[PDB]
Design a protein around this ligand. Structure first.
Ligand SMILES: Nc1ncnc2c1ncn2[C@H]1C[C@H](O)[C@@H](COP(=O)(O)NP(=O)(O)OP(=O)(O)O)O1
Ligand SMILES: [Mg+2]
Ligand SMILES: [Mg+2]
Length: 430
DNA sequence: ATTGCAGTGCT
DNA sequence: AGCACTGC
């Protein structure tokens, strides 16, 4: 009762840009705005691989990983923007720089954890306390939450989307105890007000729209964000969790989308996150390990402690290229020419990173794939990264993998290489 | 013949 | 350290 932790100590948000690479290309080329369009990399094989899709195009069934030729079958008027190609490979610089634009805006409001190229977690606990003391027990107007959904509402004793949103918001705000500055529901609500302001700043200053989730931890904030994408934000309160989880497939919770989540379903014979509450912590630890079992016991009750890490920059800088089918690299000159292409992009990005961020990478990770291996990687070796020089990095990379050339004669490479990967890591201040 | 990125945890 | 797993 009084000693049962409820996991309501923090206010955490997750901001996730809407169809991000599409918005970057639509900002640049107004002809693509408000159209079914997609972003594709390469073009020769089946029209290119789609990596991002506008919401107008999703209505036709176009999805990521689809070949553009196939997407055109569902959406003949689909417009396409191509990822830049430099040195014979896709180059994501435009999207990395657009990401920096958004992350720098978010950092004005609170410390952020860069979770991917287009999403960040925000710890708003402190910002909420300061806004709460400034309000002075002032009620929160619905006009301050013009794009916010309250998950689970309306409920109890209009057939249009926006009417429902407002009805749920009104029920939430009517029930709110604005007199108590330690009320978790009030704290989430102020958090949502701040996230409205953050999202308005992102859109004003970049043109980009995004969705957000506001809750008490990262997993619930991420889950909340997806509930009303695009261009909306969703508040998931602690009280909303039992009903939300009662029909929520386990795989929807971050970190349970793969083999572990599949094993939870199979071993326990359950389907939904809420069903996990019927197991003891020791039972879950016995099946999934001490760490996973404790995490699951708390998470199915809406409780998680993983902190928002103060990290705005990526901690690795990597470049990779696949050589599928008949393009697999089969000669030494080939392997050496492509390692140089990769090393030259990496040098360009590393030099820019050092100037911008006052740090230097110290380790070079070299990874390859050989034809036949189903694994993403077939070998990974690390060597020292002492100079930002493409020719040196490419020469060193060749040195650590040259022993894998099984061909008796040097000039040939066997079995052929279907992937080259270079990654700079182990940053130190400079 | 998805591709090209990333971070965390195990051992 | 090298690898499996999981997420954009
Ligand atoms: N498997 C992949 N391979 C290459 N690029 C990818 C990728 N998955 C995503 N990207 C790139 C392209 C994506 O635009 C960007 C962000 O990833 P998301 O947030 O999963 N997808 P989006 O933001 O487009 O749509 P919304 O959030 O509205 O659902 O990362
Ligand atoms: Mg995302
Ligand atoms: Mg996104």
């Amino acid at each position: 009762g009084p000693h049962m932790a409820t996991g309501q100590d923090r206010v955490v948000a997750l901001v996730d840009m809407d169809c991000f690479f599409v918005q970057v290309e639509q900002r640049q080329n107004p002809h693509l705005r408000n159209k079914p369009c997609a972003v594709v990399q390469y073009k020769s094989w089946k029209g290119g691989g789609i990596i991002a899709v506008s919401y107008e195009a999703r209505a036709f069934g176009v999805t990521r990983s689809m070949w553009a030729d196939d997407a055109k079958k569902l959406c003949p008027d689909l417009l396409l923007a191509q990822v830049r190609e430099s040195r014979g490979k896709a180059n994501l610089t435009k999207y990395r720089e657009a990401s920096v634009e958004v992350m720098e805006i978010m950092s004005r409001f609170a410390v952020i954890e860069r979770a991917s190229i287009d999403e960040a977690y925000v710890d708003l606990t402190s910002a909420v306390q300061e806004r709460l003391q400034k309000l002075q027990g002032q009620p929160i107007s619905a006009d301050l939450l013009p794009s916010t959904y309250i998950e689970g509402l309306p409920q109890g004793p209009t057939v249009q989307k926006e009417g429902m949103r407002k009805q749920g918001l009104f029920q939430w705000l009517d029930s709110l105890q604005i007199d108590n500055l330690t009320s978790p529901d009030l704290q989430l609500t102020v958090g949502a007000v701040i996230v409205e302001e953050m999202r308005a700043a992102i859109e004003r200053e970049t043109g980009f729209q995004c969705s957000a989730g506001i809750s008490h931890n990262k997993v619930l904030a991420k889950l909340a964000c997806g509930l009303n994408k695009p261009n909306r934000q969703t508040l998931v309160s602690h009280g909303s969790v039992p009903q939300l989880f009662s029909q929520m497939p386990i795989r929807k919770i971050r970190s349970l989308g793969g083999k572990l989540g599949a094993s939870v379903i199979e071993i326990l014979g359950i389907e939904y996150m809420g069903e996990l509450t019927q197991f003891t912590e020791s039972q879950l630890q016995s099946h999934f390990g001490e760490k996973n079992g404790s995490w699951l016991y708390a998470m199915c009750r809406g409780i998680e402690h993983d902190p928002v890490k103060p990290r705005q920059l990526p901690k690795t800088i990597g470049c990779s290229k696949n050589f599928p089918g008949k393009t697999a690299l089969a000669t030494r000159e080939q392997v050496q020419w492509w390692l140089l292409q990769l090393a030259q992009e990496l040098e360009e990005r590393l030099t820019k990173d050092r100037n911008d961020n006052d740090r230097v990478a110290t380790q070079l990770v070299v990874s390859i794939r050989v034809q036949g291996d189903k694994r993403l990687s077939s070998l990974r070796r690390c060597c020292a990264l002492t100079r930002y020089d493409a020719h040196k990095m490419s020469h060193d990379a060749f040195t650590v993998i040259k022993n894998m050339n099984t061909s008796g004669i040097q000039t040939e490479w066997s079995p052929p290489l279907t992937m080259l990967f270079l990654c700079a890591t182990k940053f130190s201040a400079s």
